């Protein structure tokens, strides 16, 4: 159902150590698929998922050009924002851009988004109607006015509603095995004595895709007021994700506790228990 | 693909 094509753009000024660093990464859902980074001789857009490794030079020549154009404009906007805020050339600044389009279960445009940030804070946001912008301050208001005069919202909406959606379809086809054929969690419980009278039960979910998951501990098929340590979901490096959730329990009472796992890749939610 | 449209701030 809900799929998305998203880019994350980072540009960092390097005062008198060359032009700004510019990096652009592309994701479909939770899968990275391309990248451009202007630290090389020829910086080029390059595949970062196997299912792109068979795209021809029409794709890479265009996306290289487009990425270089993007870097250049970001150098311009970094200069411009330096002026607005009356900052010296000595200091390093960061400009970030995130945009994406989402599909609904009908395969059609459902929503788009686009945000700029300067030095790690909101600067300029495209509103939900993709027709207008919100500025955080006086400087961003100048940016709003320039975008109004230029019909930037119209241009971005055209990308988000048409082009973005068209390519997101193409990518979901090319990458079906990764993107549509999900990976359920391989799931297990480990047991770690803490003291003479209590142990940690740790519920592992491993090798799953996509990232979204729910891990829950139940005592007697009901909630508890117990110590419930949950780690941030983390990449395994292989395209999949890992998570665990731990509860500390009275030694001998481990069979009262059950781990509940929900993931889009499972036919049905799974439950789980420490197996001595 | 990337946006063909680049806002000037």
């Amino acid at each position, epitope marked *: 159902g809900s799929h998305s094509l998203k880019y994350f753009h980072t540009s960092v000024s390097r005062p008198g150590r060359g032009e700004p660093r510019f990096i652009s990464v592309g994701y479909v859902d939770d899968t990275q698929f391309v990248r451009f980074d202007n630290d090389a001789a020829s910086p080029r857009m390059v595949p970062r998922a196997p299912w792109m490794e068979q795209e021809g030079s*029409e794709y890479w020549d*265009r996306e290289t050009r*487009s990425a270089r154009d993007t870097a*250049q404009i970001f150098r311009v906007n970094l200069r411009t924002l330096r002026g607005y805020y009356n900052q010296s050339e000595a200091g390093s600044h960061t400009l970030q851009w995130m945009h994406g389009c989402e599909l609904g279960p009908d395969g059609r445009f459902l929503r788009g988004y686009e945000q700029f940030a300067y030095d790690g804070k909101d600067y300029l946001t495209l509103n939900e109607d993709l027709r207008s912008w919100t500025a955080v301050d006086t400087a961003a208001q100048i940016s709003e006015q320039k975008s109004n005069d230029a019909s930037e919202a119209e241009h971005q*909406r*055209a990308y988000l*509603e*048409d082009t973005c959606v068209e390519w997101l379809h193409k990518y979901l086809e090319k990458g079906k095995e990764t993107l549509l054929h999900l990976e359920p969690p391989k799931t297990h419980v480990t047991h770690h004595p803490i003291s003479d009278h209590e142990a940690t039960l740790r519920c592992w979910a491993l090798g799953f895709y996509p990232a979204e998951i729910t891990l829950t501990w139940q005592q007697d098929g009901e909630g508890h007021t117990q110590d419930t340590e949950l780690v941030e979901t983390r990449p395994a490096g292989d395209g999949t994700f890992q998570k665990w959730a731990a509860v500390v329990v009275p030694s001998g009472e481990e069979q009262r506790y059950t781990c509940h796992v929900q993931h889009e890749g499972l036919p049905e939610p799974v439950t789980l228990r420490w197996k001595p | 693909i990337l946006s*063909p449209f680049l806002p000037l701030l």
Partner: T-cell receptor
Amino acid sequence: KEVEQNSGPLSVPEGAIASLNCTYSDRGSVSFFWYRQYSGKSPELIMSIYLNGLKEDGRFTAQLNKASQYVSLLIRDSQPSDSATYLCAVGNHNTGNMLTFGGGTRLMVKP
Amino acid sequence: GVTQTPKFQVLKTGQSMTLQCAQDMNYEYMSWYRQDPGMGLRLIHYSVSAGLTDQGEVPNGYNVSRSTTEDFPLRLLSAAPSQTSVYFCASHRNRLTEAFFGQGTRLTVVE
């Protein structure tokens, strides 16, 4: 020839609706323009369109259909000042060479 | 906003000639198109920003340079009758958005 317009000239009665069509060959096109050029003058932008659909401004309407790769302009209530050459231009994102122009269509508004 | 000079120009075969173009909008992109009678604009050369140039559809006979944002001169090396034409400079915010053209340069090359 990537951008196609009939040279014409086309005749329209004063007061009547004029319609102008433009096709383009590359599905990579992402931006579309109608320019008007008076004899011996420079192209002036009439309208711009980017989203698939209809777009209205005063007497002018444009239509973009990316599935069928055409753009069109409609001029309601044609006046003598609409007598000009109308230029179609597309931005082809696959080639990147700024705007590619059609050969133009001349419109004579006859009173 | 786009100041192109000169408006008219006659040249002898073999002469060289620089058309000037300046813009006050401080935009990155600048272009040179030519237009022969009854035809559309064809791109000669363009510049993505200060320091950079790129060929267009019909680069032959012509050089360009871009030291500054503001200016983008076109240079005929060795004038030929085929280069009798109207030349239009433009400025653009993005590669594929609205071209803002200058007033144009009508140029005839005579033996």
